[PDB]
A paper describes a structure:
To develop an understanding of the structural basis of nanobody binding affinity, we carried out the biophysical and structural characterization of a series of six nanobodies targeting the receptor binding domain (RBD) of SARS-CoV-2 spike protein, comprising a hit from screening a naïve nanobody library and five affinity-matured mutants derived from this parental binder; two of the mutants have been shown to be potently neutralize the virus. Recognition of the RBD by the nanobodies is dominated by CDR3 and CDR2, with CDR1 only making a few contacts.
Analysis of the superposition of the RBD suggests that F2 has no systematic effect on the RBD structure in contact with the H11 nanobodies, consistent with previous observations. H11, H11-D4, and H11-H4 adopt the same CDR1 conformation, while H11-A10, H11-H6, and H11-B5 have quite different CDR1 conformations. The change in CDR1 is a result of the mutation of Q98 in H11 to a smaller residue (G98 H11-A10, H11-H6, and S98 H11-B5), which creates a void. This void is filled by F29, which alters the structure of CDR1 but maintains the structure of CDR3. In H11-A10, H11-B5, and H11-H6, the carbonyl of T30 makes an additional hydrogen bond with the tip of R52. This gain is somewhat offset by an increase in the unfavorable entropy term compared to H11.
Author numbering:
A (entry chain B): 1 to 125
B (entry chain A): 333 to 528
C (entry chain F): 1 to 134
Write the structure that this text describes.
Amino acid sequence: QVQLVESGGGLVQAGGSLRLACIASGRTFHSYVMAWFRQAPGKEREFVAAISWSSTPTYYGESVKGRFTISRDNAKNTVYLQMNRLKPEDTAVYFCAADRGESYYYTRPTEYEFWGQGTQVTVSS
Amino acid sequence: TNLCPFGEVFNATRFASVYAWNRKRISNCVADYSVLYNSASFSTFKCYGVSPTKLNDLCFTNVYADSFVIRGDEVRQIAPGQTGKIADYNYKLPDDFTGCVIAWNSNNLDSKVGGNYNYLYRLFRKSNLKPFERDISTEIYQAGSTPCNGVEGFNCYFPLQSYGFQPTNGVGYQPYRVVVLSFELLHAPATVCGPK
Amino acid sequence: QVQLVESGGGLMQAGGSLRLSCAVSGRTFSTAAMGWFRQAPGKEREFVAAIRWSGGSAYYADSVKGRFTISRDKAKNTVYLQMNSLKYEDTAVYYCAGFSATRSLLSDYATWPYDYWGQGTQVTVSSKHHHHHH
Ligand SMILES: *[C@@H]1O[C@H](CO)[C@@H](O)[C@H](O)[C@H]1NC(C)=O
């Protein structure tokens, strides 16, 4: 019955910045490892970032390390993705995912029980 | 200098039926997870209350390795806060579980042409298991208002049933070996530490 | 490496008794079951009886219920069929079966495919009706 709702997506210029947010309903957020995945035009869900219960550790896909920051606010049941120095390649639907457990294989979609419908980011030139 | 015997648990030739789940105590040994770090075939490898990346840096006052076989659709139930036949009647994790759950598809060893029916689950029970409770009784289950007195019949059922592990089975009905590592942190000396 | 070996078949007059035995070597059927099937010439295999090996509860085909008793001795690793009130019509090859599958509902063993079976023992019943009319 847990719902994840992403927001904060839309159009942005290459070089620009965007902050994604995902709110979990109820009060189970604190018990979740939170992650962001993305699906580019005609490719599979790809891992972007994850954050453990205490805010440490954090994990990042190779292609967003340095540029993106994942963070959580348990008091607002919200996980955030700060995206800086955006490129056209970052154009995708960004999906929020959640699990009780922190996976050794944190990049696998099958390790996350809960999924939002995603928010569309478009990076133009 | 003497490593915890994870090999004896993960590579055991026989695995227990889930209802009769096996428990090995691990104590007074160095817990080197590097052999799990270099594994890619596990279908799931999740820790609760600790990061998998910190297992070589942590000390515990006790470690238990619980092992058993279930169906693919049931691996979800080996996690805190789950309901279903396995969580309710066979193997129950606590709501505040500290430890790791590792599972892998065991079709190569646990399914045979004609089907392997050696792995059992409890189908009926008068109440839910408490966490880490084990029920190996075979009492005829009283489903009706009339007592069974050990005779099977209408509303009088044998409480266990075989999994049917056939090679033609869908992913959800294929066998999965499960290892649960439970970590205890009490006001007591640490028995199990990582290499560093 | 398991074998089921039946013994105790033979000729009987209608109204009489026979005891079939089946000695199991190589394994037990612990929480599962053993059973008796029969097949008359040119007729399909028919379920006779099944017994839960651990608890000893029995299930019977309607045609033999109250006349045949299935039982087992765990120490001798043997299942038995006591065939009382024999009828012409009970005439068949009788063979014991093993089930590796533990089924919660004992009645399942009426139709569940057995994974073990013995050679078979012939049971012929004499009548004074002279059934075979020319
Ligand atoms: C199981 O299999 C092989 C045996 O050489 C080994 O690489 C591995 O260490 C074993 N697994 C564990 C968890 O010890």
